């Protein structure tokens, strides 16, 4: 077997050491724009998020209202694919035709929206999603280091060329990244065993996963001239974990629990002895996938807007402490230290 | 004294990083066959388990019903030797004559069964066990790095040559493995201070023990052409620990607590305030060895079959995530990372 | 991004290994004097504390009574600047005119006192503080690696030259130290995420911060001939942490919680079911800064004098165990070992 | 300051890996004899304990009955010196004249006994102790790396030459050992911050302390031909810690809590709601030193004999697992591994 020189680590094991903060770095001047899909050196991504946050491909988080609410703030949602092709396409269509400063929209001023797909019924689901107006797709899987994903991306390329964007994942190392990059993925999702590994035994600390995949992505860019955006998926407990994920190289972040707490999540608001909660279950739980996970409750946080703006104001503030006015500048200037077990 | 460069680790400190999963790796195509006794390069083992699980040499787990139930699933039990020679031989005989797709049987279609022996009364116990039809024997001891075991194996060779198979142990390092290999053991058992060390002070994290013994076993194979199967004994808390043990090099796994929970274990089923439990005590407890351990209760799990098949389906699934269709392929392709203290 | 070879550590992870204790090292012969402001090689600091303790720039700790009580023992307080320029100046004036063996005083026998300033209204606050008689100033900020601080120090130099002393901070690495040193700081404060980091994600274990800044300060001294005193600010839970901070290179220590417990702190004494407590809130809490922190209670300790003398007697005693009669000798002879996670 | 490459560790962080156990290593054949005082290469120590255990120099453990009871088993007690010279001498005399297979006695068949002394009134205490018949003395101090101890040993040599044996300590590193060795100590005691460091901040994990001091002691032996026995003092929680301490190089072990639990300890037996306890307080507690420590209760264990024999049977058993029939052989053959934080 193959072993590693160092153990893997989670976001909770890191802290950022401040860099020079210039008089021009104030939160309001921080640009949180970020590329969503791959492009060649020298060019810009065809799709850029206004904020580096995307909602998880889950029944309990990415519904119509979520997609609309997040797009309004500059991010994008990936309508869950764990439902009929007709239902998902309908949700996508509803978001695209809803309108009939930081909002994420297309050339027709319609909100952007994503849609998750699986490596099984894509020959029928994809066309339906494209026709419905889906701006981007993403293969939804825990272990994306699979030939099934290569086959799915290949089919999409054969039928649509590079006109249909498709993210792939999840992977946690350079080999997995490399495989999906060569297969043609527009963006690669990072993360196995991090979300809200102690059942199947597969996974890797999210921080180590991001750091290693990013190094491979950069190596890949230097070899091919192709920059593939990567997504840190899961493992984000606190707002500062967002800044860490971005500083370590992730272009954007996918979150489930974070968004499930909002009024716009498609789950029922339930009051548990004085506390308003919201339902939240994984796609691997028996409660789903029947149209690897648990079924629980998250504290109600109110509307997405206020929470997202508060979280991002914190990120912007921290970025200025690190002397960065943009995500790429943060990824370049960030000083990241591991913290001792005892300190935690 | 002799010290080591790194501290030892337990199974709980590791995770598997996925490898390429091909379209042909589906759980139903995973072969869990594994060698039980030593053979030379180029040949096959005279005895191959259908599944890599064997029940512990304990009064509270390996009785007749257990031996039969496990053999039916492809594994083998080692009837405890902590009883009279006549009683143990009778149990062995009963299993061999019980019948008067994955079942483990001999050329006469009789279920395979093992029997534990000690380094004291073997001159009388062994012949009785051989006559009773025992398919394989195993010296039952915590510290197998002993001249007493060399003497026992030597006596068996002198009287039966290589016609009677005998496992030895336990050891936790290359030196101990080497000593039992040269003594003639057919398979070497790994593990001291792991089962369900804080009393005598001897032992080693199971993971480190397996990894180090396996490296020595491989070195030994390259030097002599003799492949000696090794058994990871104890320290398995969760199903994924099985996959880890196998990925690290163990050919098969010995378990006590895991099997004690089943209806077929020879212990009394007791109800403790709404919970059906089963008795489970170590061979080192005063409750035994009078014909180093504790006496407790384990939650009732039902019949062996359903539990074993569920556990192995998980192992098979994980093996496919690692791109392996067989145990040897898993041992070759597995990517194993240590996890930080804080992550746990 | 930039990463580090080792994780950071806190004071709790260290212990001092005794050195040779000579017959002349008795507690009463230990000199705790220490430089407060920078000087060139070969000279003495214009301001030397009698004891290496200074009270934090906080509303809940450094008021008039505190400043007087601490100065009487040989230390100095930094009257909080989170109040009107007129109020702070009045407090400073009151301390300077209060008197109208180890007391810290000026040539006119008046108690020494410090005052915190911010990088915003200093053009008006500073002159008022100088006129009021403030002996030293200190820019109060969490992230002192800022151009705003360079600008503030520069303004002070342009108007007062080196006649007005001003400390700066906080920083946690060599780069931050270097930046404030070149900007002209008279002393640099160390510490971010240590006080009584899990919200913004910035910081560093106090021990690592002190050790690294001190090495840079020493390197800086060798290159320029300028010795800049450094202050370990926050992260001191137990008395022995003081000895550690000093042994690691800090010239003096800034504390908040420690002094807030005293009768002389400006907070209300409140009895909570049999226990007399005192209020203590951070400057980052909403409870302040409205003229990043929590609002709590600390156990009443009585008058500053008895507590400070008890704490320092312990430090002196430990210094003798290390064979040191002075802080510089301690910094030179101290043997400091990290302790394992498990030992704690 | 001086730092170290690795953090220090405690006994709880180690385990012994078995070595070859020969047919001749049975517990009853294990020799636990060990040297108490220094000798030159090629010779034997003038005083050899029958068992490697000595009771602590404490008011709550080493009284007359303890000294007699331990000597009967082969060990020796050090009558506490924290009492009047007349009282201590009387206790020593009482043990020497008490009798007016493994017992530790002199040429006149009288039980051996030790006595603690301080670096203050030794000019009067020592002569009284020698006249009373004390077989060995030991300077009782937490930080023995002191000129006061050198002065005390020097005075003893000047007046008695090498006819009066005196142990010194405590130290935790090679430098401290070296200093007391050159000063003339007959045996050096190891241990600061281990007994039943979080107050003064000085100390070192007991295991690291023993390992480092032993390496220096061996280096010293090779340079001078003088073998100085070392004593692991404190930090022993479980019986197996004894085996570890000996395996790491300690010739003998000093214990307080362990012996305080016995009927023969000089403390009052008190019943606390169904549990018979015994008082146990440190020499640094206010409860003493008035003729750094806590005052507590330890569970009653009964008479010393049965407990000591049970503890040593375990040590002997473990020694055989390591292939050792004697302590020196154990120190030579022991395989000691550090254990991960998580494993504990
Ligand atoms: N990130 C994690 O750690 C994690 C863990 C568990 C579950 N999940 C989530 O649960 C949901 C399902 O994930 P998943 O990976 O278990 O589902 P998946 O569809 O990606 O799983 C594919 C695996 O390959 C098999 N297979 C056999 N033939 C196949 C074919 N023709 N095409 C594709 N696969 C074939 C099975 O489908 C098996 O599920 C997702 O939302 C995923 O994110 C995530
Ligand atoms: N794996 C562990 O960590 C662990 C720990 C404690 C107990 N156990 C279990 O307890 C049971 C007993 O194990 P054990 O090792 O204590 O028993 P064992 O029979 O292997 O022990 C042999 C040891 O050598 C001695 N000895 C002296 N003469 C001997 C002779 N002629 N032949 C053999 N030994 C001689 C004693 O028997 C002593 O018990 C086993 O089932 C074992 O698995 C396991
Ligand atoms: N040490 C720590 O870890 C920590 C953490 C949080 C808060 N605090 C305390 O809270 C109090 C406030 O600290 P702070 O650093 O948040 O306040 P600060 O005044 O030092 O913060 C300056 C930051 O730059 C911005 N800025 C924009 N224009 C500016 C200008 N012209 N001049 C200066 N800054 C400008 C904002 O003021 C922003 O607060 C202090 O007492 C500080 O010690 C300490
Ligand atoms: N091992 C530990 O970690 C630890 C910690 C605290 C206390 N203790 C115990 O408490 C008891 C007292 O230990 P201690 O070291 O505090 O006492 P000690 O007598 O060894 O201490 C000597 C120190 O030097 C000073 N000194 C000044 N003049 C002196 C002189 N002329 N001679 C000697 N010392 C002079 C003081 O006495 C001061 O106590 C002992 O039993 C000791 O084992 C042990
Ligand atoms: O172990 C898992 N069991 C599940 O049932 C499950 N469902 C989703 N996911 C994955 O978790 C991400 C969301 O994580 P957070 O809630 O931590 O943001 C998601 O974006 C997915 O990557 C699962 N992981
Ligand atoms: O410390 C011990 N004290 C005992 O009394 C004892 N009895 C058995 N064994 C050993 O433990 C293995 C079973 O472990 P699990 O329950 O963890 O599967 C078994 O297979 C044995 O190796 C003991 N170990
Ligand atoms: O995280 C923080 N939030 C706050 O609100 C805050 N207020 C003060 N400080 C800083 O803490 C130091 C005092 O710490 P102690 O109480 O630990 O001595 C002080 O000297 C400051 O450096 C803060 N840090
Ligand atoms: O920190 C301490 N405060 C005290 O008051 C104290 N009194 C004794 N000792 C030392 O501890 C040893 C006994 O330890 P155990 O109870 O762990 O065997 C003893 O042998 C001494 O080395 C003290 N250490
Ligand atoms: K900064
Ligand atoms: K895979
Ligand atoms: K000393
Ligand atoms: K052995």
């Amino acid at each position: 077997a193959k072993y590693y020189n160092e153990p893997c680590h989670t976001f909770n094991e890191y802290l950022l050491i401040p860099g020079l903060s210039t008089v021009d770095c104030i939160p309001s001047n921080v640009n949180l724009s970020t590329p969503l899909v791959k492009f060649q050196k020298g060019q810009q991504s065809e799709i850029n998020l206004k904020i580096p946050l995307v909602s998880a491909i889950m029944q309990s988080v990415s519904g119509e209202k979520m997609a609309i609410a997040l797009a309004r703030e500059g991010g994008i949602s990936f309508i869950f694919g764990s439902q009929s092709i007709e239902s998902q396409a309908a949700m996508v269509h509803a978001v695209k035709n809803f309108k009939a400063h930081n909002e994420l929209v297309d050339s027709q001023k319609r909100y952007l929206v994503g849609a998750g797909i699986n490596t099984r019924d894509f020959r029928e689901r994809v066309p339906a999603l494209v026709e419905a107006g889906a701006d981007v797709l993403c293969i939804d899987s825990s272990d994306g280091f699979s030939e099934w994903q290569k086959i799915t991306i290949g089919w999409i390329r054969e039928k649509y060329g590079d006109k249909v964007k498709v993210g792939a994942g999840n992977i946690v190392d350079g080999e997995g990244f490399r495989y999906l990059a060569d297969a043609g993925a527009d963006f690669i999702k990072i993360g196995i065993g991090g979300g809200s590994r102690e059942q199947k035994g597969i996974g890797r600390g999210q921080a180590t996963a991001v750091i290693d995949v990013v190094a491979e992505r950069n190596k890949y860019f230097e070899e091919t001239g192709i920059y593939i955006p990567v997504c840190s998926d899961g493992g984000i407990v606190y707002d500062y974990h967002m800044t860490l994920a971005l500083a370590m190289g992730a272009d954007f972040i996918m979150l489930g629990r974070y968004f499930a707490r909002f009024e716009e999540s498609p789950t029922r608001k339930v009051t548990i002895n004085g506390s308003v909660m919201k339902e939240y279950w994984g796609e691997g739980s028996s409660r789903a996938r029947n149209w690897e996970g648990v079924d629980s409750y998250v504290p109600y946080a109110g509307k997405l807007k206020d929470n997202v703006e508060a979280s991002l104001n914190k990120v912007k503030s921290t970025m200025c402490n690190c002397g960065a006015l943009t995500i790429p500048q943060l990824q370049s200037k960030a000083k990241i230290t591991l913290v001792s077990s005892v300190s935690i």
Side-chain angles (χ1 to χ4, degrees), chain A residues 132-314:
Chain A
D135 299 289
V136 59
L137 310 176
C138 189
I139 300 171
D140 176 28
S141 173
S142 60
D143 174 17
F145 203 167
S146 169
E147 185 176 354
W148 295 114
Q149 286 208 23
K150 173 176 182 173
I151 287 167
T152 297
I153 301 175
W155 185 88
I156 296 174
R157 289 292 171 249
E158 170 177 53
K159 192 180 190 305
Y160 301 106
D162 293 299
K163 298 300 188 180
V164 168
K165 308 304 182 183
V166 53
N170 293 18
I171 49 77
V172 292
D173 70 345
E175 292 183 12
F177 169 85
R178 168 85 55 174
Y179 184 77
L180 292 180
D182 289 332
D186 285 297
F187 76 75
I188 293 165
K189 213 140 66 55
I190 304 165
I192 297 179
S196 300
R197 52 194 173 73
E198 299 175 60
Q199 184 66 313
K200 203 168 187 178
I202 66 171
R204 194 182 211 177
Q206 194 66 198
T208 301
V210 174
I211 294 174
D212 290 346
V213 173
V214 164
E216 192 61 41
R217 183 277 297 293
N218 290 343
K219 178 183 303 183
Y220 190 82
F221 175 68
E222 296 303 316
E223 314 177 316
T224 66
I226 303 164
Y227 183 86
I228 301 178
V230 299
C231 171
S232 182
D233 182 18
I236 286 203
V237 189
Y238 303 116
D239 286 335
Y240 86 87
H241 284 351
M242 291 176 186
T243 313
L244 281 179
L246 298 171
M248 293 173 179
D251 298 273
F252 53 101
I253 307 163
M254 177 168 280
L255 304 82
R257 169 193 156 67
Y258 179 85
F259 289 110
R261 299 171 307 148
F262 307 148
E263 188 193 59
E264 298 97 328
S265 69
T267 63
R268 289 169 52 269
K269 195 184 300 177
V270 178
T271 303
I272 300 180
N273 67 297
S275 292
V276 178
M277 314 287 285
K278 292 218 68 175
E279 306 178 295
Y280 181 60
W281 62 86
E283 289 293 295
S285 72
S286 59
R287 179 166 181 177
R289 52 190 277 284
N290 202 188
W291 49 282
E292 298 185 302
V294 299
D295 181 45
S296 55
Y297 297 103
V298 292
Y300 180 62
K303 307 208 73 178
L304 177 158
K305 188 182 190 304
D306 304 294
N307 288 275
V308 167
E309 307 197 321
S311 292
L312 296 187
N313 277 323
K314 182 174 300 176

Side-chain angles (χ1 to χ4, degrees), chain A residues 7-19:
Chain A
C8 53
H9 306 279
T10 56
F11 290 138
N12 274 148
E13 301 177 62
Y14 296 89
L15 288 180
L16 286 156
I17 292 173

Side-chain angles (χ1 to χ4, degrees), chain A residues 83-91 125 128:
Chain A
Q83 62 179 310
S84 81
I85 291 175
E86 7 295 309
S87 296
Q88 179 179 34
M91 287 187 60
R125 188 177 298 276

Side-chain angles (χ1 to χ4, degrees), chain A residues 53-116:
Chain A
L53 306 183
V54 309
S55 58
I57 317 183
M58 305 171 71
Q59 310 181 323
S60 59
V61 12
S62 295
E64 279 178 51
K65 296 187 184 179
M66 179 62 71
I68 292 166
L70 182 48
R72 281 176 174 168
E73 294 301 299
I76 200 174
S77 294
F78 286 85
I79 278 56
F80 59 103
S82 58
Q83 62 179 310
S84 81
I85 291 175
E86 7 295 309
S87 296
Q88 179 179 34
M91 287 187 60
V92 165
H93 190 75
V95 175
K96 299 303 298 178
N97 295 150
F98 190 70
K99 306 168 78 174
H101 294 300
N102 285 68
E103 54 175 39
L104 185 62
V105 296
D106 55 34
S107 60
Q108 295 177 57
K109 283 301 181 182
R110 306 176 301 177
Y111 293 124
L112 251 56
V113 69

